Design a protein around this ligand. Structure first.
Ligand SMILES: CCCCCCC(CCCCCC)(CO[C@H]1O[C@@H](CO)[C@H](O)[C@@H](O)[C@@H]1O)CO[C@H]1O[C@@H](CO)[C@H](O)[C@@H](O)[C@@H]1O
Ligand SMILES: CCCCCCC(CCCCCC)(CO[C@H]1O[C@@H](CO)[C@H](O)[C@@H](O)[C@@H]1O)CO[C@H]1O[C@@H](CO)[C@H](O)[C@@H](O)[C@@H]1O
Ligand SMILES: OC[C@H]1O[C@@H](O)[C@H](O)[C@@H](O)[C@@H]1O
Ligand SMILES: [Cl-]
Length: 485
């Protein structure tokens, strides 16, 4: 019943949001392919590529175990973790669009720092800057886009952002496959192409307006409704406008969500706002996402085949994220948590044992065409199972079970421990693979068993139930009944 359709304002916001999502996915998916390139390894980590062919030909589990090489991947997420708090502050004091702008600018400057890197300190300075971009943009871009979108197609545009991210992953994989055949400086093109959507984002981010919600929260109702009318193209926006003032009056009268978050009425949610992210990262999904090319390279794929296999993981992640829309709205959260968990579990066991039967505990041995094919196939079945379970639900259900009196705290801790464990995966996958050998896949498998047991016994169905009623579904539960008075 909100009047107002598609305007040039929402086209602009959608250009900027698409650029931001593509940037997320691209900077996530480019690092692994570039780490697998022997030009890049020669120029920044020579001690690593010496230990791979003539010297140390078969030592599969530890060829790439170097803390600086993995810092190249992880520093982005370290910086994103810290920059999310900084973006919280700057969105409050100045505005969400300012954080959008700062994130786009960080994307641009860091992409250029990466492309022009003549030493390793430049390299991870650029990565830290891309992380600053992620920290400022993941905050600002989605809720700016949702505020700007007409209520009718709002969900469609948010789903568009969501899949902009995964298609960006696939785009980065493809760019890596392509630039790897450049005779020189292909990794530069790979890391640097991020600068194009980054400057589209910088420009659009600068010219776009403060949202009517923002003007309402800083007391400019007069400007707010005029801007709402101009952004909607409808000649009266009263129904939407006073729902916005209701929302901002409600948000204003909550004192502090951090003291409410740890009162017992909300401690199921708090538990799940801490357990869901950890679990999502201890699945081992970013093993694949960050390090699929170098994993295939340690097992003896060959550069070309490793990059192509990363491309197929990207294709499967994209298609399965497509079906995850239909999946999360046809089936319940418990069903898909359980199904995806057992799928990932079977695949992790199988992959770990193929690798163990070919290389043992000493890292010496040969892959076979059939075992290489099976390892890739079950990696992909694994990421497909993740892509319609712990992937989307790992953000969906923490927001779902969080009333507005607790939602800022809930999403703060959600994103921060998710980012911290993302960082740990990126910083320690290769050294864990060295110390645990093929047993690391068994470790990830047993932790997925643990998290699925956790979901089966502790999280009740939250699909289709309203926020104001989650309380009841929480004390119908045999265990959480302990916490609601
Ligand atoms: C800590 C790091 C630096 C922060 C700089 C913030 C930036 C420029 C951002 C870049 C330009 C925009 C992409 C926002 O500047 C603009 O922000 C707009 C909100 O979006 C306001 O509508 C506008 O009035 C303001 O000038 C300038 O700060 C201003 O913030 C105002 C309060 O927001 C202050 O009243 C003002 O003393 C201050 O000088
Ligand atoms: C380098 C980032 C890679 C992706 C990481 C997950 C990420 C991106 C930001 C992560 C936080 C960074 C500090 C994509 O979001 C999800 O989109 C789903 C769509 O089906 C996918 O299935 C799922 O795998 C993916 O995690 C989560 O989305 C963020 O932005 C909003 C989107 O609208 C969400 O409203 C918000 O709360 C969430 O914070
Ligand atoms: O597709 C891979 C991505 O899936 C998302 O659900 C996770 O939040 C990210 O950490 C991961 O990189
Ligand atoms: Cl704004």
């Amino acid at each position: 019943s909100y009047e107002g359709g598609v305007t040039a304002f929402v086209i602009m916001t959608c250009i900027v949001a698409a650029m931001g999502g593509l940037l997320f996915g691209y900077d996530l998916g480019i690092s692994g392919g570039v780490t697998s390139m022997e030009e890049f390894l020669t120029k920044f980590f020579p001690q690593v590529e010496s230990q791979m062919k003539k010297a140390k030909h078969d030592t599969a589990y530890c060829k790439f175990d170097n803390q600086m090489l993995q810092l190249f991947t992880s520093s982005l997420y370290l910086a994103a973790l810290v920059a999310s708090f900084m973006a919280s502050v700057i969105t409050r004091k100045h505005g969400r669009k300012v954080s959008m702008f700062i994130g786009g600018l960080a994307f641009l400057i860091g992409a250029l720092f990466n492309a022009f890197a003549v030493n390793v300190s430049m390299l991870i300075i650029g990565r830290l800057l891309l992380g600053v971009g992620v920290g400022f943009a993941n905050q600002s871009t989605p809720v700016y886009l949702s505020q700007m979108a007409p209520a009718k197609i709002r969900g469609a545009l948010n789903i568009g952002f969501q899949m902009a991210i995964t298609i960006g992953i696939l785009v980065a994989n493809l760019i890596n496959y392509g630039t790897s055949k450049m005779a020189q400086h292909g990794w530069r093109v790979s890391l640097g192409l991020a600068a194009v959507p980054a400057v589209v984002m910088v420009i659009g981010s600068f010219i776009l307006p403060d949202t009517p919600n923002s003007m309402l929260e800083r007391g400019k109702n007069e400007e707010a409704k005029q801007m709402l009318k101009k952004i909607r193209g409808a000649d009266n926006v009263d129904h939407e406008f006073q729902d916005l003032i209701d929302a901002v009056e409600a948000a204003k009268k909550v004192e502090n969500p951090w003291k409410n978050i740890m009162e017992s009425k909300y401690r199921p949610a708090l538990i799940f706002c801490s357990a869901i992210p950890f679990f999502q990262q201890i699945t081992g999904i970013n093993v694949i996402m960050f390090y699929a090319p170098v994993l295939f390279k340690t097992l003896g794929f060959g550069d070309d085949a490793a990059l192509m296999s990363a491309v197929i993981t990207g294709v499967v992640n994209m298609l399965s994220t497509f079906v995850s829309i239909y999946a999360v709205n046809r089936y319940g959260r418990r069903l898909l948590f359980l199904e995806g968990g057992i799928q990932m579990f079977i695949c992790q066991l199988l992959v770990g044992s193929f690798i163990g039967a070919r290389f043992g505990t000493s890292g010496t041995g040969t892959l076979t065409p059939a075992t290489a094919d099976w390892i890739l196939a079950f990696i992909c079945v694994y990421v497909a199972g993740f892509a319609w379970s712990w992937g989307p639900l790992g953000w969906l259900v923490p927001s779902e079970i969080c009333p507005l009196e607790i939602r800022p705290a809930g999403q703060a801790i959600n994103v921060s421990v998710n980012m911290f464990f993302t960082f740990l995966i990126g910083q320690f996958f290769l050294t864990m693979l060295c110390h645990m050998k093929f047993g690391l896949f068994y470790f990830f498998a047993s932790m997925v068993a643990i998290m699925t047991v956790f979901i089966y016994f502790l999280l009740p169905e939250t699909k289709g139930v309203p926020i104001e009623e989650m309380g009841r579904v929480w004390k119908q539960h045999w265990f959480w009944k302990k916490y609601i008075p």
